[PDB]
Amino acid sequence: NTNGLEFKPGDFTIVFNNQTYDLSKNSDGTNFKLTGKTEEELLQNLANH
Amino acid sequence: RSSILADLFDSQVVDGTTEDANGNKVNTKVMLSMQDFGLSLNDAGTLSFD
């Protein structure tokens, strides 16, 4: 659980339904620190996210 | 006729929070007219009731 992607607030947001949500945030608002061992096993974690 | 209008738009202010563009969750102060309470005026000078 040492390394990971330290999600950046504000600097990453997406729109659909013309609704903007920041996804560096989690729904609680946490810039997440996704521990992914490999690119795609992190990518499934994105599916988990 | 106008005096009625001036009489109509004195109001009291409330606090708020809002989104603007980017998940930008702001905190807000605002003034409340009956329209804000819900009662919306048209350019036709008549009032709707939500």
Side-chain angles (χ1 to χ4, degrees):
Chain A
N1 55 7
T2 50
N3 296 112
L5 183 63
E6 295 56 52
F7 296 2
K8 57 191 184 294
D11 198 351
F12 182 76
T13 66
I14 297 169
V15 174
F16 195 66
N17 298 100
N18 296 70
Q19 198 300 315
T20 309
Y21 173 60
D22 179 346
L23 304 100
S24 72
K25 300 289 94 175
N26 308 139
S27 59
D28 63 359
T30 48
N31 289 332
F32 194 64
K33 191 260 189 184
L34 174 46
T35 176
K37 294 83 200 170
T38 71
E39 291 66 20
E40 187 164 0
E41 169 271 347
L42 188 153
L43 197 47
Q44 74 180 359
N45 282 282
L46 183 62
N48 307 344
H49 266 254
Chain B
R1 202 163 164 206
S2 311
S3 307
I4 296 168
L5 294 174
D7 208 317
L8 183 63
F9 293 99
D10 60 294
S11 279
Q12 290 155 28
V13 290
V14 62
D15 173 38
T17 185
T18 290
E19 177 58 48
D20 201 38
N22 200 58
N24 298 337
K25 190 48 52 202
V26 298
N27 283 107
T28 318
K29 188 74 206 185
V30 301
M31 183 67 92
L32 294 174
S33 85
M34 71 296 294
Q35 186 282 333
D36 292 331
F37 290 89
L39 192 145
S40 311
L41 182 63
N42 47 34
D43 62 321
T46 48
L47 294 174
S48 59
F49 183 39
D50 176 354

